[PDB]
Amino acid sequence: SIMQRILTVFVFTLLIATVGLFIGQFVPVALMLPLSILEVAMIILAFWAVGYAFVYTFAFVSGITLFPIVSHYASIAGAYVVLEAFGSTFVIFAVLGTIGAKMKKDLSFLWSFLLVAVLALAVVGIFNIFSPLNSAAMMAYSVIGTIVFSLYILYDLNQIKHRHITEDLIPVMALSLYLDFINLFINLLRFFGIL
Ligand SMILES: [Pt+2]
Ligand SMILES: [Pt+2]
Ligand SMILES: [Pt+2]
């Protein structure tokens, strides 16, 4: 059920994200920033169990505040960069995720590394907001992002197969997927753009 319920939730959050992007282009800037802060707040709070309403709210908000990067890279490198990026994200998600659904060996150890990795990304990202890195650094940083988050997709579906995830845990667990998805998309899209 979990591999049928949680997945459905994830895809639903994808739909809501899409609506958030479509609406997001109409959303005036300077109001994007507090939505971003709200996004970080929801992330920190959820993983400090959040219900469906929380998840979908964050889905809409995240769907909105991703518009700047989307429109930027589309308007500098072509709409294809965005599309190819999206499809690529989809494929890596499907393949590596499926591997998560099949491979027996409990990938619970790497949880340490993975965490250390995301935190690392966070560090760089934080630094990046204050003192921006050159394109050369953005490329590397992006590649690392793609790797770490592909790993997080894999690991996540593996834990869906293994760990005693109660029914009620459905939303926040599906949220763990959505973040792993969105983050890959960005780091994979930005990769295509710099090229
Ligand atoms: Pt399944
Ligand atoms: Pt395996
Ligand atoms: Pt979990």
Side-chain angles (χ1 to χ4, degrees):
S1 68
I2 310 299
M3 298 176 67
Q4 180 70 51
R5 293 190 70 184
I6 276 186
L7 289 201
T8 40
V9 172
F10 172 82
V11 179
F12 296 160
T13 61
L14 286 186
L15 297 173
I16 299 194
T18 297
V19 188
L21 176 52
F22 182 89
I23 291 176
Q25 183 161 359
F26 173 62
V27 173
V29 294
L31 175 56
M32 279 280 194
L33 177 51
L35 291 176
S36 170
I37 297 178
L38 164 74
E39 212 153 315
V40 173
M42 272 187 293
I43 295 178
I44 293 175
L45 276 163
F47 288 79
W48 179 90
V50 295
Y52 295 99
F54 181 99
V55 158
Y56 300 137
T57 299
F58 167 79
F60 187 74
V61 173
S62 174
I64 295 185
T65 77
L66 54 78
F67 167 76
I69 317 98
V70 173
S71 70
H72 179 66
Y73 279 99
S75 170
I76 63 100
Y80 70 96
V81 172
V82 171
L83 267 60
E84 306 291 331
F86 162 71
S88 195
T89 301
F90 173 85
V91 173
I92 309 177
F93 168 80
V95 170
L96 275 68
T98 301
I99 298 186
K102 292 301 178 296
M103 166 162 307
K104 304 216 204 74
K105 183 179 63 68
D106 182 26
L107 315 176
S108 66
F109 52 96
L110 57 81
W111 181 78
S112 58
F113 173 82
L114 274 200
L115 184 62
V116 175
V118 158
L119 290 201
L121 295 162
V123 174
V124 182
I126 285 171
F127 156 62
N128 177 78
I129 308 301
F130 283 143
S131 183
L133 283 171
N134 56 35
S135 302
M138 267 305 189
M139 182 44 111
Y141 175 56
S142 181
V143 177
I144 297 301
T146 304
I147 290 139
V148 172
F149 287 114
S150 299
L151 294 175
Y152 250 106
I153 298 161
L154 173 56
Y155 157 80
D156 268 25
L157 265 200
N158 174 257
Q159 302 309 276
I160 299 301
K161 182 57 166 57
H162 292 8
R163 293 290 81 90
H164 190 94
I165 306 159
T166 67
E167 49 184 0
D168 79 276
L169 291 177
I170 278 177
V172 60
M173 292 297 301
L175 178 58
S176 302
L177 289 187
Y178 182 73
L179 287 207
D180 295 9
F181 181 91
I182 296 304
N183 294 336
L184 173 68
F185 173 77
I186 306 165
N187 293 274
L188 185 59
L189 184 141
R190 182 169 69 257
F191 178 85
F192 206 104
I194 289 192
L195 183 58

